[PDB]
Amino acid sequence: TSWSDRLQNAADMPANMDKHALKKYRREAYHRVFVNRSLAMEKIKCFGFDMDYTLAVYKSPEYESLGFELTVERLVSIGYPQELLSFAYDSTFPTRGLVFDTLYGNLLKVDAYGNLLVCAHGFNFIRGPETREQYPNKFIQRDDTERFYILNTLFNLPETYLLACLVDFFTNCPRYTSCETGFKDGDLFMSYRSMFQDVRDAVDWVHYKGSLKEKTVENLEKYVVKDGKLPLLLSRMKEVGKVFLATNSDYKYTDKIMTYLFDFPHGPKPGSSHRPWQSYFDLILVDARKPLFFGEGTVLRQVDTKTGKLKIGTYTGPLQHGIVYSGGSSDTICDLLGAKGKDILYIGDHIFGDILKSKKRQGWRTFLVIPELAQELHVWTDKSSLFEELQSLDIFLAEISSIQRRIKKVTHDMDMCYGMMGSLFRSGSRQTLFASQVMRYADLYAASFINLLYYPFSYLFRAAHVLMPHES
Numbered sequence: 001t002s003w004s005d006r007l008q009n010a011a012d013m014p015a016n017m018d019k020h021a022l023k024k025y026r027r028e029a030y031h032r033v034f035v036n037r038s039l040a041m042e043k044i045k046c047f048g049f050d051m052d053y054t055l056a057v058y059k060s061p062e063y064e065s066l067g068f069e070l071t072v073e074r075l076v077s078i079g080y081p082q083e084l085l086s087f088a089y090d091s092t093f094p095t096r097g098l099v100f101d102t103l104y105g106n107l108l109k110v111d112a113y114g115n116l117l118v119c120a121h122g123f124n125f126i127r128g129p130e131t132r133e134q135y136p137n138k139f140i141q142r143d144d145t146e147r148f149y150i151l152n153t154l155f156n157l158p159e160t161y162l163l164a165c166l167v168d169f170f171t172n173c174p175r176y177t178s179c180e181t182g183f184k185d186g187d188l189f190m191s192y193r194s195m196f197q198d199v200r201d202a203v204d205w206v207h208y209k210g211s212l213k214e215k216t217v218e219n220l221e222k223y224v225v226k227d228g229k230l231p232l233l234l235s236r237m238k239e240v241g242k243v244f245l246a247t248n249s250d251y252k253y254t255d256k257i258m259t260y261l262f263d264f265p266h267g268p269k270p271g272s273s274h275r276p277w278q279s280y281f282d283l284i285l286v287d288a289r290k291p292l293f294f295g296e297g298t299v300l301r302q303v304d305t306k307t308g309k310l311k312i313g314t315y316t317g318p319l320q321h322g323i324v325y326s327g328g329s330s331d332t333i334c335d336l337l338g339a340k341g342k343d344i345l346y347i348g349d350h351i352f353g354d355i356l357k358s359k360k361r362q363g364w365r366t367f368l369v370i371p372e373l374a375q376e377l378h379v380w381t382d383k384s385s386l387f388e389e390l391q392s393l394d395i396f397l398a399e400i401s402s403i404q405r406r407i408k409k410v411t412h413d414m415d416m417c418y419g420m421m422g423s424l425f426r427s428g429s430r431q432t433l434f435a436s437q438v439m440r441y442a443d444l445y446a447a448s449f450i451n452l453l454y455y456p457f458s459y460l461f462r463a464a465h466v467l468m469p470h471e472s
């Protein structure tokens, strides 16, 4: 059972809007909205959405496998060895948020400070003492964005696995010679960095020039999760405020995926006339180029909706019924909807491009969707027993040569229940970079934005007051 299976099984459920059915439902973790900083829902005036992996959650592992296979075929078609075609995506390896070090070819799981929690070279886990030969302080500067790349989105799951496949392949194929920074084949040297760049470019190419979009819209039932409760949530939001779409996808793909997600024999609820997806939004904006969107942005353009091409020129007019925007910036939303940052709850899945940058640069309220959270919650309960005993052992310390070894074996035991790269949020007792950025920049987070449906729209999401150590 994948994470997307749990969300499609939640998606098949119709809405029981009885207000205790909601209060009871919302208190099971899978359907709850979690709170890092307090949020008075009644002060929200604009609900904004990303599309891919927010409104449109792709089915796992079918979608990752498709992108992986298309990416590999792209690499082979530009000259990588034919043996890449024998690769097959394996969803139990990659965890989101890992760092690829283009210098030494390692995937790293790090904490908020760049401390190494996990180091894997290909498929072989480098344990502490050996990691020191390349990381003397067991630490990286995770800001050095020219050496390190953070595989931060669900679109990066295929290349996360692929990079480990490549490193393992070249390491063991006897026509290559391993060097510290890459692989030699006679007079040709392939560094890990150029290898990394080919994979990145292949993934881009598959997405923008290859057949990935086509194969997806050809079989949306196989690749995209559909939920009849989405029209209902958006229509409730449209009563209490304004709803808008700001997505990086182009209009044609947006229209194809949005149309699918509203393809029901009803509208907001069973019995009601179906409505076009566009009618659910006071403002629709494609080609957003987030996170640039939250700084200077780009020129505001108008989509020719009959053709899917942009109209020539910059759009200077007012917000108009039926108009579809391309580009612009966060201030475009604020101007045309007459909103300020904290009137805006932006709902998305990219911790950098949607959440961090809108919080830091514009002061927007944030809702982060974590699709894996459905599964992560299932694992964290089922095996929390060994975490409390892990946690009890860190103070079992207090004032004993085996104690520092039972902690290491418990931590590894906890990690493997999630996959080979461990939990999205933890390695044992230590929070990941990702976990830290969620807490710091996501005002709210949930396995799915649909969990909002189970809360009244006056609700005050409250988090505990934070206290410094000396304040206790």
Ligand SMILES: [Mg+2]
Pocket (backbone or CB within 6 Å): 050, 051, 052, 053, 054, 348, 349, 350
């Ligand atoms: Mg997204």
